[PDB]
């Protein structure tokens, strides 16, 4: 009953501002590194504590900003183990809160563009991608998307069954490869404080899976952190540029593989009433009816394993602003992703904008985060 006045009072509408709130040790305990005259005169160290131009180990972190950045993530592909170390020769201005928008993605990358890649997602790519973990199948429990400061937009059937138990989960944010945490910009988790489950969901035909995570303090801002604009109540999507993403349930913190880098599939819509005659082409018959909080992608021809994780968010350009993102969908089950003939049946997402922006209010969330 108290949870708007702490919303407001609380300023959870907004990002806490960078600076407002791991010792890499001694340089020769690092592995060492360097051939020719360097051999074994060099340090293997992660890139932000290695200046670009001189080669050299520096004091504090740095940042490099000229874009030219490339990093094979082959495993034995580098002169380093780690795919983030660069062998570096032996021997910070703290900004306010800036302005934020949703649906932006970096397609070039934070801090480098990667190579040797098959379906990996560069770093940061999409800022709006988060995990729910449990705190105490594995550790991911599924996936989800920014949509404010404060709160993450996942499926209801994801939630459900934690609803009085909420401290056995949480969310991670700004995460990338799932294996190290040598990443410049560090992933950021938060205590879920309510989670809002939609009135008509029912888990046993799917509809209306949908819920909002409503978490105890907002996300610090950085740049590998943003939220994902939302459509329009209704709002129908025509594009061949969408994408799933996700780490997958069982590699998700598996210590049993070089890396598990965030995973990002191309795909395109498919009309509603086409969608529902795919389906009506299969055992389920002509008289299945697709039921209209569900929309439908494109699927894979030889298929293995789904990428996009359970309560997810499908996203697609924005048709008045190509350069943005809006969520058109919210994956409904990792297996789910159909094939080259079915298509992948997704949570409407534009069928409940007005129930969120309903919730947001009630709770005294501003909902600018997910339009501006
Ligand atoms: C809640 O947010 C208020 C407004 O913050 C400003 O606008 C935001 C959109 C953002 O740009 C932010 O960076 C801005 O500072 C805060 O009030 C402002 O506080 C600053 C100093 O922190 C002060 O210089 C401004 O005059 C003040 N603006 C006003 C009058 O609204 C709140 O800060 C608290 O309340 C203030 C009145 C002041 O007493 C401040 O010392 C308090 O920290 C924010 N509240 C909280 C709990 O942080
Ligand atoms: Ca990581």
């Known amino acids: 009953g108290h949870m708007a006045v702490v919303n407001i009072f609380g300023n959870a509408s907004e990002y806490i501002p960078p600076g407002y709130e791991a010792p890499l040790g001694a340089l020769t305990a690092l592995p060492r590194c360097g051939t020719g005259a360097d051999q074994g005169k060099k340090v293997c160290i992660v890139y932000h504590r290695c200046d670009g131009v001189t080669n050299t180990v520096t004091p504090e972190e740095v940042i490099n900003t000229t874009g030219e950045g490339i990093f094979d993530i082959r495993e034995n592909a580098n002169e380093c183990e780690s795919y983030l170390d660069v062998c570096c020769g032996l021997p910070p201005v703290v900004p306010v809160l800036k302005p934020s928008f949703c649906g932006i993605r970096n397609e070039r990358g934070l801090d480098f563009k990667i190579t040797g890649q098959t379906n990996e997602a560069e770093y940061g790519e999409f800022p709006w991608m988060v995990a729910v973990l449990k705190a105490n199948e594995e550790q991911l429990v599924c996936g989800g998307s920014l949509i404010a400061p404060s709160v993450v937009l996942t499926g209801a059937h994801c939630v459900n069954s934690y609803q009085s138990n909420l401290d056995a989960i949480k969310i991670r944010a700004g995460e990338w490869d799932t294996l190290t945490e040598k990443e410049r910009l560090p992933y950021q988790e938060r205590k879920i404080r309510q989670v809002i489950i939609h009135s008509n969901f029912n888990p046993k035909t799917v509809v209306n899976d949908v819920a909002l995570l409503l978490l105890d303090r907002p996300l610090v801002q950085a740049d590998n952190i943003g939220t994902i604009c939302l459509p329009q109540?209704?709002?129908?999507?025509?594009?061949?540029?969408?994408?799933?993403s996700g780490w997958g349930k069982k590699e998700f913190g598996s210590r049993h593989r070089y890396s598990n880098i965030?995973?990002?599939?191309?795909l395109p819509t498919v009309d509603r009433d086409k969608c529902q005659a795919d389906l009506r082409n299969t055992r389920l018959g002509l008289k299945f009816v697709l039921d209209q909080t569900f929309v439908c992608?494109?699927?894979?021809?030889?298929?293995?394993?789904?990428?996009?994780?359970?309560?997810?968010?499908?996203?697609?350009?924005?048709?008045?602003?190509?350069?943005?993102?809006?969520?058109?969908?919210?994956?409904?089950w990792g297996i789910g992703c159909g094939d080259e003939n079915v298509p992948g049946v997704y949570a409407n997402v534009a069928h409940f904008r007005n129930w969120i922006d309903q919730e947001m209010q009630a709770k005294g969330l501003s909902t600018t985060p997910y339009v501006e």
């Open positions: 992608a494109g699927g894979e021809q030889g298929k293995d394993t789904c990428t996009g994780d359970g309560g997810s968010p499908l996203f697609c350009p924005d048709p008045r602003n190509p350069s943005r993102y809006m969520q058109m969908g919210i994956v409904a």
């Open positions: 109540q209704s709002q129908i999507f025509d594009s061949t540029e969408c994408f799933a």
């Open positions: 965030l995973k990002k599939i191309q």
